[PDB]
C-alpha cells in the first residue's frame, strides 16, 4: 500500500522512475507549454 511499495524499489528500483517521471514530467511539460503560450499571445 505504501511502505511495501517502497521495498520494491530496493529490490528492483526500476519502477519508481516510471511513476515519478510520469507525474513530474507531466507537471513540468504541462507548465512549459502554458508559459510558452502565454508569452506567445502576450506580445
Measure the CA dihedral 13/11/19/6, to 10°. Answer: -120
The DSSP result for 1-43, as a single string, is: --HHHHHHHHHT-SSHHHHHHHHHHHHHHHHHHHHHHHHHHH-
Contact call for residue 14 and a second copy (CB under 8 A):
no
Cβ 42 to a second copy, closest distance in Å? Answer: 12
Contact call for residue 30 and a second copy (CB under 8 A):
yes
Contact call for residue 27 and a second copy (CB under 8 A):
yes
Residues that bind a second copy (CB under 8 A): 1-9, 15, 19, 22-23, 25-27, 29-30, 33-34, 36-37, 40-41
Amino acid at each position: 500500500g505504501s511502505q511495501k511499495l517502497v521495498f520494491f524499489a530496493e529490490d528492483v528500483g526500476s519502477n519508481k522512475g516510471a511513476i515519478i517521471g510520469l507525474m513530474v514530467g507531466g507537471v513540468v511539460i504541462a507548465t512549459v507549454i502554458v508559459i510558452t503560450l502565454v508569452m506567445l499571445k502576450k506580445k
